[PDB]
Structure 1
């Protein structure tokens, strides 16, 4: 994978302390659309590796970070810059719509 796996213990240093933007995928194994989002984000992570880090947070095993960002729908993608969420995307939007969302902010 070109995405990084992040956990409640690594969240702050892998995502909140990053020097570049990080797109975090809150996913779960019971969430069928999580299975559509996954290969899209592997492609974006590979294609945009110089500009953007893409991280995956499994809410099944990392409840603190999901609760901390008030995640209630899966998938939720949050783009972080400088320790702050800057955009929140809920549901599977498809690659082209994600690239548009990332186009101005990255």
Structure 2
């Protein structure tokens, strides 16, 4: 089953990346992913929880490399899944391959000192 409030993520494209990711004065986390990749499918529910839980500290976004390969090569992040953390529309940290909740919330507790 699914629902319109099951996630707090945003979806971005090569035509909208500047208006959402580079527009953000707060920290924003882009996951470059595709539905056809196993590790992408495995990190998606962990990022969905991170979007729902960490909304006050950061924003969580997805770039679909299957329909925006332009944005995938623009940052050289084609080696999916690939996570970029931006602050004030400028890149600050890079991560590649899947994470579990513990590893993802360590790398985001680096900006959320409250947990974990």
Q: Which entry has the higher C-alpha Rg, 1 or 2?
A: 2
1:19-58: per-residue Cα shift (whole Å, max 9, x none)?
2111101001221111111111110101111111000000
CA distance in 2: counterparts of 1:77 and 1:90, whole angstroms: 6
Q: Give RMSD over aligned pairs.
A: 1.1
Specify every segment of 5 or more residues in structure 2 that has no aligned partner in the other structure, as ranges: 1-6
Moved over 3 A (4+): none
Specify every segment of 5 or more residues in structure 1 that has no aligned partner in the other structure, as ranges: none
CA contact (8 A) 2:46 2:99 kept: no
Aligned residue pairs total 106
1:51-82: per-residue Cα shift (whole Å, max 9, x none)?
11000000010122111100131100010111
CA contact (8 A) 2:86 2:93 kept: yes
Using the size of structure 1 for normalisation, the TM-score is 0.93
Using the size of structure 2 for normalisation, the TM-score is 0.86
Question: Does residue 43 of structure 2 align to residue 54 of structure 1?
Answer: no
RCO comparison, higher one (Cα < 8 Å, 6+): 1
